[PDB]
Structure formats: structure tokens, C-alpha cells
Amino acid sequence: HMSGLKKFFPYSTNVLKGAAADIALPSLAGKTVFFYFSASWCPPCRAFTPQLIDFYKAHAESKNFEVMLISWDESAEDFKDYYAKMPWLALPFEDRKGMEFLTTGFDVKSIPTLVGVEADSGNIITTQARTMVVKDPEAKDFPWPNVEAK
Amino acid sequence: HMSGLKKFFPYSTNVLKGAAADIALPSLAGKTVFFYFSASWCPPCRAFTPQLIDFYKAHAEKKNFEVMLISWDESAEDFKDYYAKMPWLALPFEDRKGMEFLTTGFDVKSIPTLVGVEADSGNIITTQARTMVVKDPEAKDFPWPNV
Lengths: 150, 147
Fold this sequence. Notes:
Chain A is α/β, with parallel strands linked by helices. Chain A is built from five helices and seven strands. The longest helix of chain A is centred in the middle third of the chain and has 17 residues, at 43-59.
């Protein structure tokens, strides 16, 4: 059940949500999920994050998607402060190997990077959603499959 | 000849096969052709490809079918190293327009996506080959018709 999404998380069954660390993956059924590779020490992330946050507040519910922070922060403390500023989900910091698995899996060489996947099938939509969040703020072409074509 | 399948390729007369690049569509006559939408940046593809490779090498001749890579790679260099590892066919990377035509035609919204079509009628025979390759490694119910 939800084996597609589970393939992205060999070492975690639950992800964080602000206060609680109790949201279970299967609760994302039917949604488009975006992995956001980001960190507090990254200048472009600091500039992109507020943009992603506006996009999230505008379309999350309507377009039925979720966002999950996958942190490249180097300390549990930095992670905690940085993630406090976001409204979406996060892969716990303690799951470093899970961060590494996702980072290598999608070939993420730099941040910020925003990867869109389908929860139900576990299929990938695009690794280049970061650009589209700003180019298509009204989400007319969401979730932007194969942006890589351009 | 091969009028129907030829319409799937409005911009390429020949397709790849290793280092080749001289494969003509007429060779695919009377066969089932699987359009495999994939890219190096895709984890589920990376896990399915070796399964499809085993399946190809074990049934391509008997059940007589072919596989063609339709690449969502972001660059010619990525395509090159990614395709180098596959044994089947590929739509030339440079034909981005072609890849987009086929993407729109099969309505591919994410990858991996594997679609089987009857080369002769250009009809889609099956849309569940991705699942069934895994559930039916032996190729008992191939080609799992569902359209």
C-alpha cells in the first residue's frame, strides 16, 4: 500500500509537520508531492523559499500537492530553526541516509532544487519545478512534467 | 509499408540501436513495440530498467517485440551515457520535437511509462506492461491486453 511513495523513504515511515513528527506517508495518497532540497546556509534558497511559500499558500489545497523539505543543513539545530520558518512537511534530520539516498537518486548537485513526484504511482514528474514555481505562479501548467525538455 | 507506425515518427526516418543510427521502422513489422519513456534522473526508472532488460533478453525474440527508449533526459551527454547501457532501440536525442510528439500522443505525465502498441495497426495493445513485466516475469499472459 503506497509502495510507490515508500520507495523514496527506505528509512522513515513518518515525516515531520511543524510540531508533530507523526504524519504517515500513506496520508499523501492522491497528491502530487514535491521534494524540496534546501538548507539555511544557501543564499539562493533563502531567496527562493519565500517564493515557494507563496505558491504553497495559493495552490497546495486547490492543486492537491504537498511539499517536503529534504535538508542539506549540517546540524540538527540549524535544521530546526530553518524548518521552523516553513509551513510544509520535512524528512527528519536524523534520517541523513535517507537524505543521501534521495539526493543521489535524483542526481541533485546543487540547491535549491524542487522535484515533483506522484504519490500513488511513485513516478517522477520533473526535477526542475524550482524554475516553474516562479515562471508559472498561477500554476496553469502545474505540475510541469518534463520541464527538462526545455 | 508500415504506414501506421510511421505516423508515430513525424521527424525521424531512422532510429538508434547501440552506436548504429540506421534502423528503419519497416523492420518492426508484425511486432509489438513498447515505447519506454525514461531518463537518468528517475529513480523508479533506474529500478525498473534492469527488470525490463532481463525481460527483453528473455522474450523479445519468442514473443517477438521490440523496445524503444523515448528520452526525457536533460542533455545529449546524459542521454548518451544513459542509453549506452540499454540493449534495445532509441529515438535519437536530437529529435526533441519527436519526443514531445510521442509524449503528447501517449499522454505521458510522468515516468517511467511503458506503452505497447501493435506495430501494424498503430493501436495501443496494453498500458499495464510496466506492472506486468514485474508480476509476470515469465511472460505467461503477455501482452496483457487491456484496451
